[PDB]
Design an enzyme around this catalytic site. Structure first.
Site, PDB file in Angstrom:
ATOM      1  N   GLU A  35     119.207  23.252  86.566  1.00 56.82           N
ATOM      2  CA  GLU A  35     118.458  22.849  85.447  1.00 56.82           C
ATOM      3  C   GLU A  35     116.967  22.596  85.823  1.00 56.82           C
ATOM      4  O   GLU A  35     116.172  22.989  85.139  1.00 56.82           O
ATOM      5  CB  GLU A  35     119.008  21.581  84.893  1.00 56.82           C
ATOM      6  CG  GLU A  35     120.283  21.798  84.059  1.00 56.82           C
ATOM      7  CD  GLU A  35     120.107  22.610  82.759  1.00 56.82           C
ATOM      8  OE1 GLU A  35     118.921  22.752  82.362  1.00 56.82           O
ATOM      9  OE2 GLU A  35     121.095  23.095  82.197  1.00 56.82           O
ATOM     10  N   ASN A  46     111.327  24.517  74.245  1.00 50.34           N
ATOM     11  CA  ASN A  46     112.356  25.382  73.561  1.00 50.34           C
ATOM     12  C   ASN A  46     111.700  26.010  72.399  1.00 50.34           C
ATOM     13  O   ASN A  46     110.742  25.527  71.910  1.00 50.34           O
ATOM     14  CB  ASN A  46     113.571  24.513  73.128  1.00 50.34           C
ATOM     15  CG  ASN A  46     114.190  23.835  74.336  1.00 50.34           C
ATOM     16  OD1 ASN A  46     114.388  22.601  74.409  1.00 50.34           O
ATOM     17  ND2 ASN A  46     114.351  24.653  75.354  1.00 50.34           N
ATOM     18  N   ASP A  48     112.661  26.016  69.277  1.00 47.25           N
ATOM     19  CA  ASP A  48     112.677  25.098  68.132  1.00 47.25           C
ATOM     20  C   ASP A  48     111.618  23.976  68.213  1.00 47.25           C
ATOM     21  O   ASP A  48     111.606  23.141  67.340  1.00 47.25           O
ATOM     22  CB  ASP A  48     114.132  24.502  67.952  1.00 47.25           C
ATOM     23  CG  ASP A  48     114.507  23.567  69.044  1.00 47.25           C
ATOM     24  OD1 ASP A  48     113.801  23.370  70.058  1.00 47.25           O
ATOM     25  OD2 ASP A  48     115.515  22.928  68.942  1.00 47.25           O
ATOM     26  N   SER A  50     111.492  21.617  70.560  1.00 46.69           N
ATOM     27  CA  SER A  50     111.924  20.475  71.342  1.00 46.69           C
ATOM     28  C   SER A  50     111.564  20.795  72.780  1.00 46.69           C
ATOM     29  O   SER A  50     111.243  21.959  73.044  1.00 46.69           O
ATOM     30  CB  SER A  50     113.370  20.300  71.142  1.00 46.69           C
ATOM     31  OG  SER A  50     114.085  21.393  71.690  1.00 46.69           O
ATOM     32  N   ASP A  52     112.739  20.012  77.037  1.00 49.62           N
ATOM     33  CA  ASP A  52     113.772  19.497  77.996  1.00 49.62           C
ATOM     34  C   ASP A  52     113.039  18.783  79.143  1.00 49.62           C
ATOM     35  O   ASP A  52     112.006  19.275  79.572  1.00 49.62           O
ATOM     36  CB  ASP A  52     114.551  20.672  78.578  1.00 49.62           C
ATOM     37  CG  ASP A  52     115.337  21.436  77.544  1.00 49.62           C
ATOM     38  OD1 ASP A  52     115.603  20.884  76.471  1.00 49.62           O
ATOM     39  OD2 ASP A  52     115.718  22.610  77.737  1.00 49.62           O
ATOM     40  N   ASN A  59     117.194  17.012  76.386  1.00 52.18           N
ATOM     41  CA  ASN A  59     116.480  17.600  75.252  1.00 52.18           C
ATOM     42  C   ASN A  59     115.989  16.529  74.230  1.00 52.18           C
ATOM     43  O   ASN A  59     116.695  15.596  73.853  1.00 52.18           O
ATOM     44  CB  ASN A  59     117.375  18.635  74.585  1.00 52.18           C
ATOM     45  CG  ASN A  59     116.691  19.373  73.346  1.00 52.18           C
ATOM     46  OD1 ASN A  59     116.830  18.975  72.234  1.00 52.18           O
ATOM     47  ND2 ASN A  59     115.928  20.355  73.591  1.00 52.18           N
ATOM     48  N   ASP A 101     129.692  12.813  74.692  1.00 52.81           N
ATOM     49  CA  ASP A 101     129.407  13.313  73.345  1.00 52.81           C
ATOM     50  C   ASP A 101     130.525  14.287  72.811  1.00 52.81           C
ATOM     51  O   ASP A 101     130.598  14.743  71.671  1.00 52.81           O
ATOM     52  CB  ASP A 101     128.050  14.030  73.365  1.00 52.81           C
ATOM     53  CG  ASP A 101     127.575  14.391  71.997  1.00 52.81           C
ATOM     54  OD1 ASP A 101     127.502  13.419  71.235  1.00 52.81           O
ATOM     55  OD2 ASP A 101     127.211  15.535  71.605  1.00 52.81           O
TER      56      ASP A 101
END
Length: 129
Positions: A35, A46, A48, A50, A52, A59, A101
């Protein structure tokens, strides 16, 4: 801070990630390697809008607040900058909620594509834990 493999394994272990939700330490180390390349300061934007953040690339669309991801949640209740510290505590604490989650570690795309079903124990081989 750029961690070394075993230094990160020991820090994660100390922060209770070893077998957290059933994921052995090697998973966590492998996820971090792919990562962020073990770099706490890593950021990636990203499509969209957002971003990371950190060693585990958490995120800003759901987990942290960066002040520029409209309509995002801040489930970990932290500024995303906290994720970039040389102290991994915030990253680990928010990771523990992410992995609980419901999707487990599949939340981390690099884990799913590069770690999942591989010999993850190899990432901790040779370390003094």
């Amino acid at each position: 801070k750029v961690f070394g493999r075993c230094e990160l394994a020991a820090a994660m272990k100390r922060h209770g990630l070893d077998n957290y939700r059933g994921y052995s330490l090697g998973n966590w180390v492998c996820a971090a390697k792919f990562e962020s390349n073990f770099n706490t300061q890593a950021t990636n934007r990203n499509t969209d809008g957002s971003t990371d953040y950190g060693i585990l690339q958490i995120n800003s669309r759901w987990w942290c607040n960066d002040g520029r991801t409209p309509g995002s949640r801040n489930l970990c209740n932290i500024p995303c900058s906290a994720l970039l510290s040389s102290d991994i505590t915030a990253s680990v604490n928010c990771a523990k909620k992410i992995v609980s989650d419901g999707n487990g570690m599949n939340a981390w795309v690099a884990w799913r594509n590069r770690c999942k079903g591989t010999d993850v124990q190899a990432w901790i081989r040779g370390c003094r834990l």
